[PDB]
Amino acid sequence: PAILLVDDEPHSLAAMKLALEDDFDVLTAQGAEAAIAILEEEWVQVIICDQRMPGRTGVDFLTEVRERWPETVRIIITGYTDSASMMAAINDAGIHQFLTKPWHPEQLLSSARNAARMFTLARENERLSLEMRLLERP
Amino acid sequence: PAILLVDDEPHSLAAMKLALEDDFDVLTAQGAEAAIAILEEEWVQVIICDQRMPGRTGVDFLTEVRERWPETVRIIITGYTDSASMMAAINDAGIHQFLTKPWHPEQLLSSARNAARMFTLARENERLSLEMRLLERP
Numbered sequence: 014p015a016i017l018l019v020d021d022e023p024h025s026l027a028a029m030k031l032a033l034e035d036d037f038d039v040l041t042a043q044g045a046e047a048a049i050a051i052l053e054e055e056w057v058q059v060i061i062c063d064q065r066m067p068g069r070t071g072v073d074f075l076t077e078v079r080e081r082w083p084e085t086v087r088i089i090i091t092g093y094t095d096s097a098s099m100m101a102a103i104n105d106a107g108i109h110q111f112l113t114k115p116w117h118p119e120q121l122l123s124s125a126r127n128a129a130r131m132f133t134l135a136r137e138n139e140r141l142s143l144e145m146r147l148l149e150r151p
Numbered sequence: 152p153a154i155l156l157v158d159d160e161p162h163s164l165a166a167m168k169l170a171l172e173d174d175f176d177v178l179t180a181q182g183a184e185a186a187i188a189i190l191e192e193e194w195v196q197v198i199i200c201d202q203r204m205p206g207r208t209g210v211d212f213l214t215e216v217r218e219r220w221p222e223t224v225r226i227i228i229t230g231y232t233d234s235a236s237m238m239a240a241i242n243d244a245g246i247h248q249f250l251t252k253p254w255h256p257e258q259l260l261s262s263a264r265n266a267a268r269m270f271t272l273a274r275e276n277e278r279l280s281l282e283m284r285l286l287e288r289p
């Protein structure tokens with residue numbers, strides 16, 4: 014499964030991809046609409062999304078991601094981290110973690126890695142419980 | 152299992168505990184030596200440790216934590232996040248993530264929560280694989 018990166022600024026998006034591509038299959042989208050189109054057509058484990066994008070915010074986009082694909086791990090990149098209403102929006106959206114803007118490359122890589130590990134572990138957990146049913150009960 | 156917090160400054164340590172205690176059993180230590188004593192005697196899932204402490208650094212302490220209890224999730228709090236040698240030390244230590252100093256309360260809470268979830272998932276994964284052996288093979 015892929016990591017999907019969503020950012021309206023082309024150079025930030027490209028640099029984020031460069032940071033992760035030695036470690037993950039990377040998909041990129043320039044805004045929420047393009048990103049939803051990718052989520053509908055590709056298998057995505059982790060979404061990293063910028064908050065401030067023309068039109069639809071990352072918080073709104075990721076709120077919908079939680080609704081339609083709740084097993085994804087969802088990360089938001091945002092400034093105004095000292096804003097209690099920003100923080101309350103991120104929590105209400107079911108976002109797993111935020112990264113402070115300008116995103117820190119080492120921190121982004123670690124978040125993507127920890128996020129992918131949580132995803133793998135949860136998918137393996139499900140598979141193991143299902144295989145136990147195919148062994149137990151008859 | 153508990154979250155262990157390690158910080159030499161008593162007020163930061165107390166505030167970190169206040170941030171997490173509605174969500175976790177919290178243990179506290181004022182430096183690496185006291186923290187190792189706790190790890191030897193209590194069941195700990197997550198360790199959050201300050202880097203700069205009199206004598207032993209968080210990086211050194213957490214390096215030893217990786218050796219003796221590798222299934223813990225380990226977080227370091229550090230300044231100088233723009234230092235490539237700091238970053239290389241954290242990576243070499245097998246530390247899962249860093250938080251930038253002064254630690255951000257919402258970010259600390261999210262890291263502790265994601266860390267505990269990874270721990271739970273990995274322990275459940277092991278348990279499920281073992282229970283499958285008690286069903287398969289005879």
Ligand SMILES: [Mg+2]
Nearest residue numbers: 021063065066
């Ligand atoms: Mg933007």
Ligand SMILES: [Mg+2]
Nearest residue numbers: 159201203204
């Ligand atoms: Mg200190």
